[PDB]
Design a protein around this ligand. Structure first.
Ligand SMILES: *[C@@H]1O[C@H](CO)[C@@H](O[C@@H]2O[C@H](CO)[C@@H](O[C@@H]3O[C@H](CO[C@H]4O[C@H](CO)[C@@H](O)[C@H](O[C@H]5O[C@H](CO)[C@@H](O)[C@H](O)[C@@H]5O)[C@@H]4O)[C@@H](O)[C@H](O[C@H]4O[C@H](CO[C@H]5O[C@H](CO)[C@@H](O)[C@H](O)[C@@H]5O)[C@@H](O)[C@H](O)[C@@H]4O[C@H]4O[C@H](CO)[C@@H](O)[C@H](O)[C@@H]4O)[C@@H]3O)[C@H](O)[C@H]2NC(C)=O)[C@H](O)[C@H]1NC(C)=O
Ligand SMILES: *[C@@H]1O[C@H](CO)[C@@H](O[C@@H]2O[C@H](CO)[C@@H](O[C@@H]3O[C@H](CO)[C@@H](O)[C@H](O[C@H]4O[C@H](CO[C@H]5O[C@H](CO)[C@@H](O)[C@H](O)[C@@H]5O[C@H]5O[C@H](CO)[C@@H](O)[C@H](O)[C@@H]5O)[C@@H](O)[C@H](O[C@H]5O[C@H](CO)[C@@H](O)[C@H](O)[C@@H]5O)[C@@H]4O)[C@@H]3O)[C@H](O)[C@H]2NC(C)=O)[C@H](O)[C@H]1NC(C)=O
Ligand SMILES: *[C@@H]1O[C@H](CO)[C@@H](O[C@@H]2O[C@H](CO)[C@@H](O)[C@H](O)[C@H]2NC(C)=O)[C@H](O)[C@H]1NC(C)=O
Ligand SMILES: *[C@@H]1O[C@H](CO)[C@@H](O)[C@H](O)[C@H]1NC(C)=O
Ligand SMILES: *[C@@H]1O[C@H](CO)[C@@H](O)[C@H](O)[C@H]1NC(C)=O
Ligand SMILES: N[C@@H]1[C@@H](O)[C@@H](O)[C@@H](CO)O[C@@H]1O
Length: 251
């Protein structure tokens, strides 16, 4: 088989929390899995989660350039394409570039060294966007399988972020899906194939819109929309602000 194996396969339906805006400073949410930023959290934060019985997924952006990272000057001018429409100071990456791929290997080394149980590589759906680099589905498939073989070789699990079109070509290498907004877009059937193969969907809904972040609950009908869809009992849903700060509501 042209995939590699992972030792940690989280169960379908495992409750999770994700917080990417700042260093994690709240573990009061009783979730089994925490998805947090790879760079801004130290080994101590990660080990503390695991000592409390939790698994830690480390987020990083595999397909976009973030101009505030400490390794940003490793990227060459030719690695960078167009701006991401909805994220400031981010640009699409040429994920076929050997330089880009080596930078990502360096980020997986760091995730391994910090004790991450898994990695959550973002922005592998450049083909679905104005990337300015002629990126294609095959490029993403090649890149996602490259990341998965590299994470597995470092004893970490991995999952697919959105990128619904390429599921059949990477799923054997994936331990889960991270999906945004499939309920709002009536697309959760696309991602149900993961729990049909014993793999969770870590599923995010943003009912408050892309410009509103606060600590208030959503309305009952916004919660029904985020939570009620065929097979939702197999999705691990969080309701979040668009900025992915601490605030979270569960179904
Ligand atoms: C985990 O870590 C995170 C990250 O560090 C913690 O979150 C951070 O917490 C800080 C302290 O609470 C906040 O600092 C306050 O910021 C207020 C608004 O700042 C705006 O602009 C910044 C610019 O960068 C921006 O980042 C902010 O955006 C965030 O919020 C929006 C939503 O609004 C999101 O969309 C966005 O994505 C970000 O999440 C934000 O828009 C600022 O007003 C504060 O300075 C004020 O307030 C201080 C305390 O005010 C208190 O006043 C009354 C008494 O009068 C008190 O009883 C009450 O508790 C009030 O809180 C005060 O010390 C300052 O001197 C200043 O006071 C003046 O202004 C107020 C109001 O106008 C007047 O009442 C007052 O008399 C003075 O005139 C703070 O600087 C960070 O924003 C926040 N960062 C985030 C969320 O990203 C988080 O808490 C941690 N969680 C834990 C520990 O559990
Ligand atoms: C390892 O090596 C292999 C090389 O062998 C690498 O390639 C991948 O290998 C996979 C394993 O064999 C392979 O996986 C899948 O195998 C399934 C068998 O169960 C297939 O059924 C999958 O088919 C895909 O396409 C289906 C058909 O889609 C057309 O038809 C439907 C029917 O109406 C349309 O809806 C659909 O829109 C589409 O129509 C378009 O295209 C037509 C063809 O050109 C055309 O006639 C139309 O006019 C229209 O333009 C589709 O139904 C499948 O999607 C289902 O499944 C996913 C989850 O898998 C769900 O999310 C969906 O909701 C839906 O239920 C599926 O997309 C598929 O072949 C995989 O394809 C190979 N990938 C390649 C070659 O790129 C592999 O990558 C290597 N690595 C690893 C780790 O494996
Ligand atoms: C993205 O990176 C890839 C890999 O470096 C580039 O593809 C190479 O392009 C040169 C010149 O066209 C060819 O000689 C190589 O054979 C290509 N390699 C591969 C693996 O395809 C690609 O040009 C880059 N994309 C952009 C838009 O610059
Ligand atoms: C790899 O991770 C698993 C967690 O599922 C752990 O049990 C195992 O000891 C790890 N192996 C190494 C060499 O760290
Ligand atoms: C969850 O997935 C299982 C397959 O593992 C399926 O049999 C079941 O119907 C799904 N649950 C719901 C509520 O659809
Ligand atoms: N890549 C960034 C990520 O680092 C985080 O800031 C997030 C909001 O928390 O926005 C984007 O996804």
């Amino acid at each position: 088989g042209n995939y590699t194996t992972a030792k940690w396969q989280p169960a379908v339906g495992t409750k999770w929390q994700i917080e990417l805006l700042y260093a994690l400073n709240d573990t009061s949410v009783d979730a089994e899995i925490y998805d947090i930023d790879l760079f801004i959290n130290d080994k101590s934060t990660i080990a503390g989660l695991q000592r409390a019985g939790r698994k830690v997924i480390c987020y990083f952006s595999a397909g976009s350039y973030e101009n505030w990272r400490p390794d940003k000057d490793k990227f060459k001018d030719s690695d960078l394409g167009h701006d991401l429409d909805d994220w400031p100071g981010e640009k699409w990456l040429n994920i076929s570039s050997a330089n880009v791929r080596q930078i990502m290997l360096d980020r997986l080394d760091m995730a391994r060294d910090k004790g991450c149980d898994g990695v959550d590589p973002d922005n592998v759906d450049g083909y679905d966007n104005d990337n300015g680099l002629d990126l294609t589905q095959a490029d993403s498939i090649s890149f996602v399988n490259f990341l998965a073989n590299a994470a597995h070789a470092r004893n970490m699990s991995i999952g697919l972020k959105n990128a619904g079109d390429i599921i059949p070509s990477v799923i054997k290498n994936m331990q889960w899906s991270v999906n945004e907004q499939c309920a709002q877009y009536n697309e959760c059937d696309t991602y149900a194939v993961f729990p049909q193969n014993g793999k969770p969907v870590f599923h995010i809904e943003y009912p408050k819109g892309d410009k509103t972040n606060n600590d208030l609950s959503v309305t009952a009908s916004q919660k029904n929309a985020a939570c009620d869809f065929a097979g939702s009992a197999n999705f691990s849903t969080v309701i979040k602000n668009m900025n992915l700060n601490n605030w979270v509501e569960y179904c």
